[model samples]
Target: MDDLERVLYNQDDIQKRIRELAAELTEFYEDKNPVMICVLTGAVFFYTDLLKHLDFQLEPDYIICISKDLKTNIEGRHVLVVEDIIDTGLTMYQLLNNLQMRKPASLKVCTLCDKDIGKKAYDVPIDYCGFVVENRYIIGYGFDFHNKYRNLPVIGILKESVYT
Candidate 1:
């Protein structure tokens, strides 16, 4: 608590935004059983919450090992990549490119947070976005610092002194 600079998105705000995202996704994927791919570690919380709100038939997958073969056959299937945040966009870009080779019917991105750092490593389109955050060292709500603070209910900026 003392280590946090300030709270950016509280628990209520985060959950509310997630519900909105879920509604939008439900409408878009109503006709299709889309493959929802979770970008692991950081995205687990958002991915789980979003899935809970989406009352539909969907296949859940994850990018546990980027280079490993996916357990789910996404060929000819609608794929939606769920992410915790998009900072440089390089990781998502690469993931999309890899999935594209699998020949999915469609590929899209849904991120809980998007950070515009004035420059980007790739031009990736975020189909569904929950929140647009500044380029601060954010923690909590599944985001972490040294794999800590992930259990925190609210998202906030970490005090520099703690890390530095």
Candidate 2:
């Protein structure tokens, strides 16, 4: 039967870390007025929460790209790409490569969860990280399993039965 295998991060813990990240970003981009790029579907919760804590003025944009050639118009602006997780790095790599073509003044990455998947096949600079999670099938706080379990406020690993 399907069940939570383990809780990876509770809601309070996640929010506290996100708040810290927001402070770091605010300091780093104090005078830059950067563009915040929200990676869609999964990063919605993180993006909105971070936005609330940021005191600086910045532009917001969204994109959903997983190696299928996508683009965003953030030219000449300092860009901060916010993502829910950085797993294999494939999706993040492809998106960053596309964004670079727009010639943004600078580009940085932030993620709520970063899975330890060993050596990166494609290197993407991650400036801020909320949590480094062990490799596992995690769901909740915007993550999901077959489009389910995303509404949960905390992050947790799904049982083997859920996938197998």
Candidate 3:
């Protein structure tokens, strides 16, 4: 298999896992219909798949980001969203401040991959987490490398060679 064919998760596996996640989410916000804000760009695929399995109510939002370089300012918006595998949290922090201005009913983070990249914390609580990986440059599922692998059906913890 090529890099895209590494099989980190096959279709069946992804579906199964998402269904399980959705069930949990349904219960978490039984009455809230919590707005699910996707940390834009990367979380698109995960969001679509996740929604399919979630048999309950949900609200969706998209926040385009630039957390690594601090190019944009997003903050304190209720339901600031992000997907699995976040690197520097500065972007999320910036967004939170912006969102806060709007005074959303609530705010939280839900990612398929969660890592304390650079061991930094936004001091904001992550209300939901799908899975945790120690540390790595991850791709696939909805993640991307130059927007290349977002369409892949699984998540991949990149091998060093892929970088070179």
Candidate 4:
């Protein structure tokens, strides 16, 4: 059974924005090659969607949400991190700190959804963002509730009944 409290981004809207984001990324990394990192679970969909549209040189990789380890050397490498959301910015902050020690030439962040729910403890700047939304328990397009709604094609606010 599928139910939504509210729909934030439908299929058409999300795809359209993805193309636009692709254009922005192409321009951003036109002359440089960067190592793209995908945060596990959440970025599974956004990373795949954005990767195809990126028409430039980049080395892609992945890491778990909490793991700060990497087998590939980020030393002197340009790092581009792809994420699904920036809820509190805490995760990104911790990630940046961990990666910073590797001495990458540069580091950038891209997220599909940026929930503006006031300032997080760590204020990390998201270089590329697909959408800015209000604070809501979202599910769909890789966002999930108990790992259930990740496959939904559009973004939606999950009905509270399911959780409560």
Candidate 5:
């Protein structure tokens, strides 16, 4: 905890917001059988938790590379991209563009956190968002610094001293 400057969202806060997002997604994707693709590693925790709260049936998949093979068929299907955070948005942009080429019926983005960094490398739409945070070095709740703080239950700003 000392490595953190302050907590941005506690465990309860995160869970509560996730449940809300799940409810919204459940309604939006009802009967659509959307293929929910989780951006790997950082989004694993958020993706699992969100899935647990969803009331509808959907397929889950993970993507680590922009060109990696996805197990599910996305063509002519609804696709929702799940992400832990949106920083520069370059990766998300590329992923979205690549997925678009597959000819999905619709595409959307869901991110647990959106960093307000004044300007981003790319502009992307966030259909579902949990929190809009400052451009701080965040860690925890799957966000990490050198993969060390991912186990933390709450999301917090990492102290500069630790990373510096």
Candidate 6:
């Protein structure tokens, strides 16, 4: 199968992993029920499913954007359902600053695919990380390129030339 047809989580595996992740998180967090900050768009599938499996009670919040660029006009907290993390780090920087201002008792990040390359502008702990994938452009299971492939049921690394 090509990248689009690849099956990363299937359906059963995805559900199982989510429950497992939830259990782990529950044990770690205990009864605190910290604010769950779900990175939007690409993390919707993972986020929704993970929340379903969270054994302990918790609140939900989201951040979404069409592009990862942040101008003053499009800056705020607790807005859209799909949050964007720009590859360049500017968007994430703005996001952290915006959310940090809210003064949540405690916060955590839930990203399906974490593209960490050492250039992180924010130096806080991830709290909960689903996957740390290579630099390959990924699509599917809520992740997308050009807003496509987010509906795919699996994670895929599209061929380098296919995207260009």
Best candidate, lDDT-wise? 5
**Candidate 5 Cα lDDT to native:** 0.90
After TM-score superposition, what is the CA distance of residue 43 in candidate 3 from its true location, in Å? 0.5
Per-residue lDDT tens digits for candidate 1, residues 90-118, read 88888888889999999999999999697
Show the lowest summed lDDT stretch of 10 residues, model 3: 69-78
Q: What is the lDDT of candidate 4?
A: 0.86
- Model 6 poorest ten-residue lDDT run: 72-81
Which ten residues in a row are the worst by lDDT in model 5?
60-69
Using alpha carbons, what is the TM-score of model 1?
Answer: 0.95
lDDT tens digits, residues 1-164, model 4?
A: 25678889899999999999889888868777888899986798999998888887888888885564566799998888999999888889989988998899889999999997887778797899999987978889989888697878889898878898
TM-score of each: 0.95, 0.91, 0.73, 0.93, 0.95, 0.68
Candidate 4 — number of clashing residue pairs?
0
Off by over 4 Å in 3: 4-13, 66-82, 116-118
In candidate 2, clashing pairs total 0
List ranges where model 1 is wrong by over 4 Å: 65-67
Write the residue-wise lDDT of candidate 6 on 43-117 in tens digits.
667777876766766556554643443322222232222232235456565666675665545445544556656
**Per-model tally of clashing residue pairs:** 0, 0, 17, 0, 0, 6
Comparing 3 with 6 on TM-score, the higher-scoring candidate is: 3
Which stretches of model 5 miss by more than 4 angstroms?
A: none
